[PDB]
Amino acid sequence: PVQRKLDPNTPFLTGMRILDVLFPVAMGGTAAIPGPFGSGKTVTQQSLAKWSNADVVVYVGCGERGNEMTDVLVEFPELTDPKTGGPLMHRTVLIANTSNMPVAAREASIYVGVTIAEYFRDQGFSVALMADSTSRWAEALREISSRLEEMPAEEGYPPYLAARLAAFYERAGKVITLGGEEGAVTIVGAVSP
Amino acid sequence: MIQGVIQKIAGPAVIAKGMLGARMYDICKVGEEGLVGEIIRLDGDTAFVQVYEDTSGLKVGEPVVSTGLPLAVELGPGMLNGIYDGIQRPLERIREKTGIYITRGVVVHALDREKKWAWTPMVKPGDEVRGGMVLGTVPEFGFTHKILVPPDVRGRVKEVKPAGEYTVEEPVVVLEDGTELKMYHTWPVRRARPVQRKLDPNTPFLTGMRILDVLFPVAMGGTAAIPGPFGSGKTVTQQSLAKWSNADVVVYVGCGERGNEMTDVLVEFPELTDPKTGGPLMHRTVLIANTSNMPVAAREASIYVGVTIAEYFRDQGFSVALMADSTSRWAEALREISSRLEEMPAEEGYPPYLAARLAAFYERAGKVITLGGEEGAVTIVGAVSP
Amino acid sequence: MIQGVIQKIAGPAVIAKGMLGARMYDICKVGEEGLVGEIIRLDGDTAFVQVYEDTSGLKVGEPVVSTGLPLAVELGPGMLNGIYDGIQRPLERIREKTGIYITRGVVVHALDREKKWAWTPMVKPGDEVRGGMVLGTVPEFGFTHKILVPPDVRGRVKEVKPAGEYTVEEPVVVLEDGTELKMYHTWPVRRARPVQRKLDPNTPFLTGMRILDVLFPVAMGGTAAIPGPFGSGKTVTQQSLAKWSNADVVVYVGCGERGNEMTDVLVEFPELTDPKTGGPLMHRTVLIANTSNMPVAAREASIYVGVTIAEYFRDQGFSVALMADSTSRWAEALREISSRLEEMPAEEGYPPYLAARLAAFYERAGKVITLGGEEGAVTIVGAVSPPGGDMSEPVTQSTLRIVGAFWRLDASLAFRRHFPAINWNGSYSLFTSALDPWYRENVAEDYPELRDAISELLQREAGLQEIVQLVGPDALQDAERLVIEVGRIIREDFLQQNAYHEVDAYCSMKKAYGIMKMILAFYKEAEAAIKRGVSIDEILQLPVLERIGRARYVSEEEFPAYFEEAMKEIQGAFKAL
Amino acid sequence: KKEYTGITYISGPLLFVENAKDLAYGAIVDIKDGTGRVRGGQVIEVSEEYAVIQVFEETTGLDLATTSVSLVEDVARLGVSKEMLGRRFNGIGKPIDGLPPITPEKRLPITGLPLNPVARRKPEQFIQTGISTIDVMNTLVRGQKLPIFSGSGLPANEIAAQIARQATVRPDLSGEGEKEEPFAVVFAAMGITQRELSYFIQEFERTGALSRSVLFLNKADDPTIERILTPRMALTVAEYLAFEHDYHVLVILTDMTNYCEALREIGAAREEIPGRRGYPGYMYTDLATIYERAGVVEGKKGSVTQIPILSMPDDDRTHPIPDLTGYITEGQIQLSRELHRKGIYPPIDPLPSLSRLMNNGVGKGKTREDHKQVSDQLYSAYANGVDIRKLVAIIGEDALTENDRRYLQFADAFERFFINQGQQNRSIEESLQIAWALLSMLPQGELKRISKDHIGKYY
Amino acid sequence: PVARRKPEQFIQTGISTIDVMNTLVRGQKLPIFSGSGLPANEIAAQIARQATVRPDLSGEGEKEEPFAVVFAAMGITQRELSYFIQEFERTGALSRSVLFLNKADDPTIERILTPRMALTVAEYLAFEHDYHVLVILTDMTNYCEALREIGAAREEIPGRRGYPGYMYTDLATIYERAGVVEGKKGSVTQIPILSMPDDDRTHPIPDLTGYITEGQIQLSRELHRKGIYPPIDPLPSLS
Amino acid sequence: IPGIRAQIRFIQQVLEQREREDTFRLKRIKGKIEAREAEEEGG
C-alpha cells in the first residue's frame, strides 16, 4: 500500500539521444520494446543499466534459449558502474530461470521481480527494473491453464491475459512512500514474438 | 391444478419437484407473483419450468401450478390497433396502471372486456354448421369482421341472440349440446390451423417500392429473406414495406429491437392514410413490439404469437402481411435455452433442432381456400442477421 | 466352457454378464442365431461384446458363449478364384443357400471340404523337422502349392501316405510326437508369423504405368501410399495393378468399396491373360471384399486377414502384392466402436490408436528369407482417403512418416481429364537409389542419367510457371518459351495413360524408355535451333512434332522401328529449316 | 396385446421408460396417449433396466401418470403389394387420400439386407435422356446411382422432371421392342415445400404418368423425426417392384439434406461422437444403406436407378453432406451458380461431373464408335478453354496468339449453344452432330485426343 | 545456470556448407528442419561419422580429447533400420559410437523414454570423464505423434492443435543436455533433425523448437530436384 | 495483397473457432465419465 500515485511529469534520463529527445518515457513510465533477435537487441539492455538515471538495477527476465541466458550472467560482472567506478554487480539483483525450469516457477517469475522492485522502491531510491521474455511469460500461463481444465479463449493464451499482464504494469509510476519520499519504478517491456 | 415447489434456479431456467402427471408444454404459473412459463422437460416428478420473466429474487418453496393447457392467445375481434407484445399482454393497460416501467408479473386480461359492439347473427337456430363457420358480423373499423366458429367444434343451435349491444364475453350462441359457444376462442400458438386446401400462387403481391418489386417480385403467398449485415436497410425497409401495401392487415412483430426502433412505428402511423380505403392506418396493424432488454426467453414466445394471429385473420378472407423482422433473435432464444438444459450443441452453438421449428415458421404462410371457402393468404417476409 | 447371457444390447455392441476368465479379443457367438463376437473390455465380470454383424431383433437373456480362440483364418490350398467375406466365408456357397441376401446366421467352411487332391511328399517318415519346413507339394494350377510345418512345431515324422487324391481335413502326416499335420493350418491374425530373417530389397516392382516407373517408383519391399479426394482415380489406379502387376499374387482387398467396382472384377477378370502364364488371369487373385454396405465391425476385420494372407503366400515362396483399397474407412470403423464404449478421443475424434494399429500394419515385409529359404516379398501400396482434401488431417498424415514412397494424387489436375495424373511437385519416392543396380543391367546402362535430365526439366519448369502467372507468357522470350512448351508436351504425352484405351495401357520399360529419349533429343536440338538463328514458333508448327505426339499409341512390335524412324527424322528436320 | 407404464424422463424426441425387458433394438412400439391418440416410436437402446423409445412425432402434453407403450412388431416391416400404384402415404405411411386401406402380399424388413456382391450383375445399359451434358459426356446408365449436386436458387427440381419424362432406352442398338420398356417412378419426399409439391404433382398429371407410380410424402412441416424412416420405406417398395415383378424404376429421393439434419438431432441428443463438422460420425454407414440398394440383379430382369438430389449449402463442396455421398454414389453432376447468371438453362458444367459407369455400354454398337474419343477431346478442350479466360483477364484484354485465339472463341460458344437447351429434347444422334460442330471450329492438328480416322470420318 | 560456461569453441563437421557459412559451434544445439521427402537421413549419417574436432588449429596436444557420436532415431522402418547399420559398419565407427533405435512398430510407450536414454547416457560421458559428444536424435515429429497417444489415453485435454498442453515443458527438458560447464571440459552437441508435415514453419512442432533451439538450416526442394546432395540452402538458414 | 490477405485471416478465425467447440464439447464428456463412475463407487 502506498499513499499517492502522483501524476507523471518527471523526466527520465537514459542519455541516448533517440531515447529521450524523441521518445521519452518519463520516469515511472512504462514502455515496451520488441526486437527480433540476432539483431543486437541486448546492446540497449546493457547500456540501459550502464547509465540509467536510477541507481538500483534489477534485471530479470525468465527463460530464454539456453546460452543467451548465460550471456547475461557473464557480461554482467565485467561491466562497471560509470558513476563511482565501483563494480557494477554491487548495486544489482538478478533473478534467472531457464526454460527447462519447473513450470510454476516460471509463472511466478515476473511477480517475483515485480515485488522485489517495490521493496527497494519503498526505501526511497529510484529503481530500474528490466524484464524480458514477456512474450514467453505467457507460456507458463498457458501451461498452468493446460493442467487446469478451463477452456482457453482467443488464440491460445487463457483469459487473464488482460489482467495479470495488466497488474504487472500497474504498480509503478511516481509513488510517494509512506516514508514521505519519492521512488522510481519504470519497467520497460521486452517482448519478442 | 397440481402443486409443487422448486429444485434449482438457473438464469431463467427453473426446475420443480412435486409434480406428477404435469403435462408436457404448458401454461405454468410459478412464482408468487406468477410468471407463466412453459414446460419443456418433464423428468420424474421434477418438472423443468421455463419462465419468461427476470427471475430476480425467488426463494425456494413457491407454488407451482398448471392449467393443463398450452400457452395460447385469445383470438376474436377487437384486435387491430393496440400493442400486445410477446407474451400477449396488451401494454396499453399495463402502461396505464403501472407508470413508466414494466413491473414484471402483473396479470391482466388480454383482449378487452368492456367495449360494446353491435352484432348481427347471420344464421338461425337448429341449423347446421361445420367448425369455422361465421355466426355473425360485427362492426370492426372499415371491416366486415366476422366471428368464426372454432374448429373442431360443431353442433346444432339452441338459440341465437338477435341484434344488440354486447361485450364479447357474453355467450351469443348457445349450441345444441349446452355448449356456450363464446365469441372468441383460444387456440394454442404451437400448431397451425387446418385449411381446406393450399392454392397455388400466381397473383402478385406488390409492395410498390420499385427495385425490390419490379425486378425481384414475390408471389402472393411465398416467403423471402432479408439477410444483411448491420448497417444497411433492414430496420427501415420493412417499415416502408408496412406503410405501403398491397394487402389488408399488417401484423408486425419485431423482436428485441430498441425503444426508439418501434416507438416511431407507433406514433407516426396514425397520420398516414391507407391507400386501399383511406383512413388512419392503425386500423390494420398489430403491434407485438418487444423491448431488447425484455426477458430473454420471451422472444421465442413472441414470434409464435404473431404467426398464429395471422392465420386467424386469414380465415376471414383477407390478405395478411406478417413480417416479423429479425429471426436472429429467435435464434438467440434457443441458443440459451439449450445451454441451460445441457445439450451438446452443433455448429456454432445452436441446437440442432433449429430447422425443426424454423422450417415450420416459414411454412404456414401461403394462399388457400378455407372452411368458409374464402380466399386468403398470409405472407411472410423474414429478416435475418448473421 | 465359459457362458453367460445378454445384459445390455444397444448398437453394434452389447454387454453380457455372468462372465469371467475371458481373454482379450475372443470370438464368440451371441444370440440364438449365433453371430460372431469379440471380447473388447471387461469390467468385473461383465464384458463388452463386440458383435461382428448387424443386430436388431434381440432380447435380453439369450446365449453368450465363448470358445476362447482369438480370430484366425484357416489357411491352405485352394483359395484362388473366389471371393471371401470378412471372416473368410466363400459367398458362393452362401448365395447357394440364401438367394440374394447376405444373411446373418451363417456358418460354412473357409476352404471347401469336398475336393481331394493329388499328393506328393518330400520327406520320408522317421526323419526330423523343425518349424516351417516344407513337406508336401500338392499341385494347384500353374502354381506349385507346397505345405509347410505350421510355425513353431518341431519333431520327427512317422508315416506319410503316398500319392493319390486326399481330403483337406485328412491327417497326411503323423509324427512320433503324437502330433498330426493335416493339410491346412490355422493361424491367428493379431500375431505376425515370423520368418527366418529380415532383409533389404532392390528388385523393382514393375508396374507399367510410366508415371509409376520412370519418376516415382517402388522397391520390392515397397511401401507407399496413394491418396486423393473423391473422384480422383483412387480406385482405378489399383485396378491396373490387379491386371498388370508383375508378380505371383495380387491380393486385392478393399474394405468399404462398393460392389460395383468389385463385381466388375469378376466378370471382366475371367477372360484375360497373365503376364506370367497364359491362363485365366484370375488365378493370382484373392478379393476379400467387404463392401461398405455390410456390417460395421467387419470393416475392421477385413484388413488384418488380408495382411495375413499376404504372409501365407509369401511363406510358400512366392511374391505377394497386397494392396488395401481404401484403408481410411477402417479408421472410421474403428472409431465407431469407440463412441459407444466411451473413450475420449484425440483430434478429429479418432480414438487414440491411430498409430497403434497403423504402424504395426504397414511394417510388415519385403525380401525376407523364409524358414524354407525362399525369397519372400510383401509389397503393399496402401490406399487411403482423406475426408476433406486437407492433407493436414491426422489419419492421412500419420501414413507419411511411417512409410516411404509417397505419391500424392492432385485433385485439380484430374478434374480436367488426365489420369492417373499426379502432382510431381507434391510426390516423392524414397526408393530410388537402391534401385540402381537392377536398372543398369536389366534396362539400359545409361538410364538413370537420362531420367534425371527429364526431371531436370520437369521440376524446374515450375520455375517459369510461376512467372507465367505473373505477367503472362508474354515477355517471356525464347529460351523461355522453349522449355514451357517442351515440358507442355512432356505431360501431355509422357504422363497420361488410360485404363480403358484398348492398348497402350501397359508398357515395358524398354518401350517407355524409348519415348523418353526422343524428347531429350528434341530438347537438345531445339536448344541449338534457337541459338543458331531460327525460332520455336514455327518448330511447334512442324509436322514432326505431332509424330512425337501420337507416338505412344503404337505397340511394341512396331515400336523399335517406329522409334528408329524418328531417329532419322530428327537430324534432317532441324538442319534443313 | 400389451402395455407398459413407467416413464421417468421425456425431453427432446427421446423417451424413457423402465422395467421393459422384452423388446428388441429396432422395434416399432406405440405411444398410446392418455387421451386417445396413438403415435409410434423406436426401441433404439435397450438395457437391462430402462430403454430408449424414439418418438416418431412431436410430443405434446404427455404425462407422468398414465401413457401406454405397446409392441407392434418386433422388427419393423411394412407390407407391400403391387396393388398400390397411385397412392399417397405419409411418413410411416397410413394412406392419405380418403381411399381404402392397403392389402399386403408380403411383409418385408425395412432395413433390408445389402446385396451380396456376387449377386450383383454387371450394369451396362445405356439410355437416352436428353440434355447433352449427360447424354454425351457423362451419360446415365440403368443402374448408376447418380445424384445431382444442387445449390439452391438453382432449380433443383425442374431439371429432374425432364428425366422423368424422356428417359428411354434404345431398342435398336439392342434387339427388343419398345413394348418391353415403358417406365415407372417411385418418388419420395422428406420434407419439402408446398410450392415444391404442386409443381411436382402437376407434371405427373400432365403426362398422365401419375398412376403406375407411388409417391410418398412428407412436407417439411410435419413431424421432425420421421425424416429418418421415410426414405428407406420407399426404397423398400422398390426392391419389391423391382425384383419379383419386373420393372424398370427411376426413383427420385429429392433432397437429402433434410435427412442428415434430422439425423443429427438424435445423434447428439443421445451422446455419440461428432466427427467433422458436428454431423454424427457414423453417418457414413447410414448413408450407405440408402443409396446402396439399387443396381441390377443377376440373370434377372428389372432395374433400380436412383437419382436423389443433394442440396448442400452454398456452392461448397466440402460441407460434409455431399462429401460422403461422393464416395458412396458413383459420380455426380453439378449445377452451379457459375453458369446460372448467364441464363443458360438447364445449367450443368462438365468440369466436375464424372459419372463412373460409362465405359460400359458406349459406342460398341451402343453408340457411334466416335464417343470414346469424342468426349475426352471436347471435354479437354473446354478445360483448356476457361483456362485462358483467366490469363486473358490479367495480362490484357487479349494479347493472345492466333493459335490461342481460336480457343477463347470457343469458350462462349460451348457454353452458349450446346449446353444451353430448350425444353426441346434431343436425340443421341442430333446431339453428337452439334458435338462435332464445336470440335469443327478448332483447326485440325490441335485435336490430339482424337485419332486420325475418326476425325476425318465426320469432319 | 551459473555452472554453464559460455561457448567459444569450434567443431568441424566434415560437411562444408554447414561450417563455412553458418558454423556449428561447440556445446551447441541446432536442428535441421527437413521437408517431407527431402532426404534427411543421409545428411544425417554423413554428419554422423564424419566429424572430428581439430583442436590442432587452436594449439594444444592432439589426443587430449576424443570424440563420441551418440545416436538415436525412432520410427524407423525395417528399411531404414538397415540403411543405418550398413553405413555405420561400412568403414566402421560403431567402435566410437552408441546405438539406440526404437523400431517403428515397437511399443509406443518406450518411445517416449527412448531419447531421454541416449541423452542421459551422454552426460556420463563428458561430466565424469570429459569427452566431446555429439548427440543426434532424429525425427521428432515421431516424438510428438507418439507422444499424443499416451496423453490422449492417460487423460488430459489437449491444448492448441492437439499436441498435449505440457509440450513446451516436456520438449524443453530434452534439450538441456548441452553446453559446457565451467571447469569441466567435455560437452554435448544436439542436432535433432525432424520433418514437418505441413511443410511450413508454422505448424507447432517445429515452430516450438525454434524458440528454444537456436537456428535453422532448411532443405528445399529446389536444390534437390535439380539433383545436388546434400541440399542445404543458403539463405533461409542461419545459426 | 491487402485483399488476399483479408481472406486468409478469415480462414484462421474460422479454423480456430472450430476447435473451441471441440474442446468444450469434449470437456463435457469427461464430466460424464467421472459423474457416472462416481456412482459405480456405489453405496
Ligand SMILES: Nc1ncnc2c1ncn2[C@@H]1O[C@H](COP(=O)(O)OP(=O)(O)O)[C@@H](O)[C@H]1O
Ligand atoms: N441504404 C440507405 N441509404 C441511406 N440511408 C439509409 C439507407 N438505408 C437505411 N438508411 C438509414 O440507415 C438507418 C439504419 O437503419 P437500417 O438501415 O434500417 O438498419 P440497421 O442499422 O439496424 O442495420 C436507417 O434508419 C436509415 O435512416
Ligand SMILES: Nc1ncnc2c1ncn2[C@@H]1O[C@H](COP(=O)(O)OP(=O)(O)O)[C@@H](O)[C@H]1O
Ligand atoms: N486411367 C484412366 N483412363 C481413363 N479414365 C480414367 C482413368 N483413371 C480414371 N479415369 C476416369 O476418372 C474416374 C476416376 O476414378 P474413380 O473410379 O472415380 O476413382 P475414386 O472414386 O476411387 O477416386 C474413373 O472412373 C474414370 O472415369
